[PDB]
Amino acid sequence: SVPSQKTYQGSYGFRLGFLHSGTAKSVTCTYSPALNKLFCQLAKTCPVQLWVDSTPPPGTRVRAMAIYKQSQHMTEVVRRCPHHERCSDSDGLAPPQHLIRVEGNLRAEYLDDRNTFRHSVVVPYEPPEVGSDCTTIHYNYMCYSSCMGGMNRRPILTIITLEDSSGNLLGRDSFEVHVCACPGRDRRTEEENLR
């Protein structure tokens, strides 16, 4: 099967948000609204905001999962390449095979679907704290889009789902990701190409 990627705000008005990091050559993570695409460096922090119109129930969770963007690759589980899954860079919680990790959250759970074999990382949804209007999760992508034996230059999508305590769907959003050496340059190049 293939996880759905349909945008769904649901009852709580759930949707993602991204910082405005610009496209300077040195930027490590930058988001393109025009392409709905995040460009980032290997294993660098990717701040992703969670916005809702109303606070969901206690026990609500947020899951991140990568899938190949191209239909001809959709059924293939997105995983780290043969090199990176063996480079011993685990943080003591993320299995080394997982492409997406969550930083600084001891309650992060890493799932290997016994049915689909797909990987995902889920954390408890936390309401925004005093002074903030949104909640931010910091993700890391652990392979380059170009890694041989892994993504092998195939574009991927990250699907973020708001789930209830049983894993049922409350909301969904998604964005394309390109893990590269120079996000700033790549984003400028791709948006130019789009122009």
Ligand SMILES: [Zn+2]
């Ligand atoms: Zn890799």
